[PDB]
Amino acid sequence: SGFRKMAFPSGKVEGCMVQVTCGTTTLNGLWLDDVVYCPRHVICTSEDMLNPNYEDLLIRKSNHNFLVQAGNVQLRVIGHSMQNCVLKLKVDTANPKTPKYKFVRIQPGQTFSVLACYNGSPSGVYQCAMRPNFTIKGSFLNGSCGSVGFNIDYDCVSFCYMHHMELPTGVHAGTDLEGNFYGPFVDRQTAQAAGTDTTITVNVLAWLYAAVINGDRWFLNRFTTTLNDFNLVAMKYNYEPLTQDHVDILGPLSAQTGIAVLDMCASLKELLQNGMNGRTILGSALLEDEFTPFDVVRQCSGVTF
Amino acid sequence: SGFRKMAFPSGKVEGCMVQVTCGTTTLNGLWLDDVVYCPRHVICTSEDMLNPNYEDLLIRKSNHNFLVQAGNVQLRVIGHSMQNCVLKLKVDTANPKTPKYKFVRIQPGQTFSVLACYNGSPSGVYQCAMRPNFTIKGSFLNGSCGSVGFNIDYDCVSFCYMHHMELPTGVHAGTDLEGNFYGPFVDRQTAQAAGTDTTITVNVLAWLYAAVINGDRWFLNRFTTTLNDFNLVAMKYNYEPLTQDHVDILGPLSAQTGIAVLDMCASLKELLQNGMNGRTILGSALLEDEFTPFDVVRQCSGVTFQ
Ligand SMILES: N#CC1(CS(=O)(=O)N2Cc3ccc(Cl)cc3[C@@]3(CCCN(c4cncc5ccccc45)C3=O)C2)CC1
Numbered sequence: 089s090g091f092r093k094m095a096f097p098s099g100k101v102e103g104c105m106v107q108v109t110c111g112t113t114t115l116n117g118l119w120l121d122d123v124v125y126c127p128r129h130v131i132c133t134s135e136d137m138l139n140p141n142y143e144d145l146l147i148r149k150s151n152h153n154f155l156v157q158a159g160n161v162q163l164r165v166i167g168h169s170m171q172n173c174v175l176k177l178k179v180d181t182a183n184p185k186t187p188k189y190k191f192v193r194i195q196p197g198q199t200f201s202v203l204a205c206y207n208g209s210p211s212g213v214y215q216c217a218m219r220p221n222f223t224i225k226g227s228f229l230n231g232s233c234g235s236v237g238f239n240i241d242y243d244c245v246s247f248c249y250m251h252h253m254e255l256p257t258g259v260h261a262g263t264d265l266e267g268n269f270y271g272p273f274v275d276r277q278t279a280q281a282a283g284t285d286t287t288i289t290v291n292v293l294a295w296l297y298a299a300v301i302n303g304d305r306w307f308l309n310r311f312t313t314t315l316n317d318f319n320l321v322a323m324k325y326n327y328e329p330l331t332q333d334h335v336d337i338l339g340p341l342s343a344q345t346g347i348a349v350l351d352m353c354a355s356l357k358e359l360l361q362n363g364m365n366g367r368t369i370l371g372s373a374l375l376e377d378e379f380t381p382f383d384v385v386r387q388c389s390g391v392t393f
Numbered sequence: 394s395g396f397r398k399m400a401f402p403s404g405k406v407e408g409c410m411v412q413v414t415c416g417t418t419t420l421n422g423l424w425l426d427d428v429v430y431c432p433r434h435v436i437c438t439s440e441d442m443l444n445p446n447y448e449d450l451l452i453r454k455s456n457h458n459f460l461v462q463a464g465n466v467q468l469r470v471i472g473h474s475m476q477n478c479v480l481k482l483k484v485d486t487a488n489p490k491t492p493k494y495k496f497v498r499i500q501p502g503q504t505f506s507v508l509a510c511y512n513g514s515p516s517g518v519y520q521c522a523m524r525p526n527f528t529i530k531g532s533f534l535n536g537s538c539g540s541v542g543f544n545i546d547y548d549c550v551s552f553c554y555m556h557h558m559e560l561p562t563g564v565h566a567g568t569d570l571e572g573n574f575y576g577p578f579v580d581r582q583t584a585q586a587a588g589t590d591t592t593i594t595v596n597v598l599a600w601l602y603a604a605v606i607n608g609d610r611w612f613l614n615r616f617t618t619t620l621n622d623f624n625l626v627a628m629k630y631n632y633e634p635l636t637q638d639h640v641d642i643l644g645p646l647s648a649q650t651g652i653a654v655l656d657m658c659a660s661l662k663e664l665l666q667n668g669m670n671g672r673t674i675l676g677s678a679l680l681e682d683e684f685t686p687f688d689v690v691r692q693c694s695g696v697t698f699q
């Protein structure tokens with residue numbers, strides 16, 4: 089029993105974290121085989137950020153301008169190239185701790201673990217979700233750029249996020265490991281803002297199934313709804329529309345509790361229209377939306393890596 | 394910016410997790426140097442758990458009755474001993490991945506990271522706190538016994554918890570790494586229940602200071618309170634008494650924000666009376682109590698967003 093915001097074990101990623109310094113800018117890099125991946129803004133001064141021409145800044149750099157530190161060892165950069173908003177530094181040493189990995193781009197609503205790093209040294213691990221507005225509600229201070237987000241499947245690390253920036257509302261933005269931003273963000277010090285966000289409906293339903301598995305049933309009722317009628321309510325409360333794909337994905341949780349998805353949707357409709365009436369669900373007074381259906385199945389089954 | 398329930402990176406502990414099997418019972422062990430530490434109830438059947446005589450069950454075992462698996466390698470047990478509620482299995486191989494470590498027994502209110510494991514394989518990492526009733530609100534299924542709790546302040550792992558049991562209310566109990574239980578619990582299936590739990594007041598105050606550091610002050614008020622009047626009020630909401638030690642520990646957070654501890658206590662008294670009125674604090678509609686003053690200083694910026 090119990091239900092916690094659980095992250096994947098971070099050891100396989102810890103063994104990849106390095107420090108990258110270019111001039112007075114220092115941030116984190118990901119060392120996989122003989123390449124170190126990091127945000128391309130490592131080559132910018134504060135003045136450059138206002139309007140950087142990354143190709144023009146990069147052409148003026150030599151390999152020896154990049155200082156890469158792995159623990160207490162200095163790696164030698166022997167090549168450099170840019171891929172979208174990521175810089176790839178070819179080094180003379182292959183990482184002996186390179187895990188089996190893939191670079192994957194995730195969709196809004198998906199969750200991942202973040203290994204927060206400073207000066208190439210891991211500081212903590214936490215779980216988060218790619219918001220529908222393509223931001224993440226992370227916990228990052230200056231120096232955390234280059235920290236990565238990931239998921240694990242058996243022995244394979246799927247890297248999905250690299251940290252680049254904080255927005256005025258205190259939320260975060262970054263790219264996949266191919267350097268493509270999530271969201272309409274750019275790597276420059278210019279006016280940028282998080283768009284209006286919505287609640288991830290399929291994840292709230294998954295967490296209500298988690299509450300049922302753990303013994304919280306007070307919110308269940310005799311009613312059902314159609315997908316069309318439920319979505320009228322979702323639109324009214326700033327919830328994402330629920331699709332037939334979301335209903336299908338909830339199938340295993342619906343089967344393991346005996347509660348049809350549309351039956352759980354009628355419970356969610358009443359919770360939105362009336363509130364919790366002084367009660368909590370899994371120790372929360374808010375409807376939690378950062379657990380996917382797979383996260384619920386994995387935590388309620390004991391899947392290992 | 395931001396504020397999350399953050400665990401320590403788990404790699405140093407992952408390299409210590411092994412599987413221990415005795416007959417049909419299988420659970421996790423912690424392999425440090427040439428010793429594997431695990432719950433002594435690995436030698437029990439379900440029937441034995443009502444009134445176990447651990448000494449009598451253990452004397453009938455040889456070293457080769459204990460199967461220890463580290464990854465895909467079988468370790469050889471060359472000695473065994475019982476220390477309180479833990480079994481210490483001496484093995485013929487020292488763990489090459491043993492980190493710098495210490496065994497520390499913690500007090501209620503302290504937090505730690507848990508590396509949940511099954512069959513000697515890590516499944517996830519999460520943060521928790523030792524509750525005032527000496528239980529933890531973990532996430533553990535059957536097979537998770539032997540999973541450990543730890544902190545990693547300055548590259549040394551401080552192991553503070555080993556998982557042994559789930560209570561009828563769904564909360565968890567376990568020991569320090571010397572096998573001494575936290576709380577009045579026994580590794581026997583007895584009518585033992587979690588005592589009435591209370592909120593960790595010093596941690597709620599720390600989290601209110603975290604909210605101020607991150608730029609929010611809506612909950613502050615123009616009042617102060619004495620320590621005794623605050624305790625008289627807080628205990629009516631099942632909050633733990635706040636001591637002068639707790640006030641002292643909040644000193645650095647009080648200094649970074651310019652808000653005296655007793656003035657933050659007055660704010661907490663008002664939040665207990667009024668609730669949040671549709672507002673949230675650091676993305677929560679409840680008063681959070683599983684962040685210590687040390688955790689807030691560890692995670693938050695050293696510069697308040699004034
Ligand atoms: N709004 C806002 C801010 C960020 S900023 O405006 O100073 N900023 C714009 C920017 C734009 C694009 C890119 Cl690619 C990078 C960046 C930078 C580069 C430096 C590191 N950083 C930070 C990243 N993460 C967490 C931060 C926590 C405090 C400080 C800076 C942080 C950035 O966001 C700077 C003040 C919180």
Ligand SMILES: N#CC1(CS(=O)(=O)N2Cc3ccc(Cl)cc3[C@@]3(CCCN(c4cncc5ccccc45)C3=O)C2)CC1
Nearest residue numbers: 089434533534535536538557558559560561579580581582
């Ligand atoms: N109430 C209750 C229970 C526990 S029990 O009654 O089955 N139980 C009594 C007991 C007494 C003392 C000691 Cl030291 C150990 C144990 C055991 C040993 C086996 C593993 N286990 C478990 C430990 N952690 C998480 C569990 C999640 C589901 C199942 C069992 C779990 C225990 O608690 C068994 C049913 C949740």
Ligand SMILES: [Cl-]
Nearest residue numbers: 498499500503
């Ligand atoms: Cl302590």
